[PDB]
Structure 1
Amino acid sequence: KNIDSNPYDTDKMAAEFIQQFNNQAFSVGQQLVFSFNDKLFGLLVKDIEAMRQKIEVGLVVGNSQVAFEKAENSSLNLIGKAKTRQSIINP
């Protein structure tokens, strides 16, 4: 009901995420609701890397870095550097 085409800055979100979730446990596949610019988003933890050894469950800290990738077939327009598209040719 609240879907819109307005751009959402991933870098500001990342800071908010660190601001909101710093020092909190996160696990791959966890689902949560995030409040960003008075907008509710559904977030799914897809991959977690320890501060480059891979870890299954990690702790988010202030210096933790965030990279965003929009959901498959999602219309979300992600801008900024904290990212990483669809092929114009049929698969």
Structure 2
Amino acid sequence: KNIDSNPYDTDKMAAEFIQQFNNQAFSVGQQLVFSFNDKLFGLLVKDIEAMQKIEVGLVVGNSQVAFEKAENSSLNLIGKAKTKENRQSIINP
């Protein structure tokens, strides 16, 4: 009911996620609720990178977050955190 195409900066979302979840654990595939600019979103932890692939880990201040739009969603995301724009050449590869 709150879907919109308004822009959202992915790096800002990552910074807020780290700030609110600093020193808080996360496991691959975890489904949670995330607050960005008083806007609610559903987040699925797709991958965890060791700083080795581990199913679970602990969030720290320097951890990066890469936000990819869920397929079939109109959410508009911008920034270099995960993806902002992509092009698909017309010629067959």
Structure number having the greater strand percentage: 1
Greater relative contact order (CA < 8 Å, ≥ 6 in sequence): 2
Structure 1 equivalent of residue 43 of structure 2: 43
Unaligned 5+ runs, structure 2: none
Runs of 4+ in structure 1 displaced over 3 angstroms?
84-91
> Under a length normalisation based on structure 2, what TM-score does the superposition of the two structures give?
0.83
The size of the alignment, in residue pairs, is 90
| 1:79 to 1:24, Cα distance in 2 relative to 1, 3 A | same
**1:9-64, Cα deviation, whole Å (9 max, x unpaired):** 1111111001000100101111111111010001111111111x211111110011
Percent of counterpart pairs with the same letter? 100
Deviation at 1:77, TM superposition (A): 2.2
C-alpha RMSD of the superposition: 2.6
Task: Quote how far apart the aligned CAs of 1:5 are.
Answer: 1.3
Gaps of 5+ in 1: none
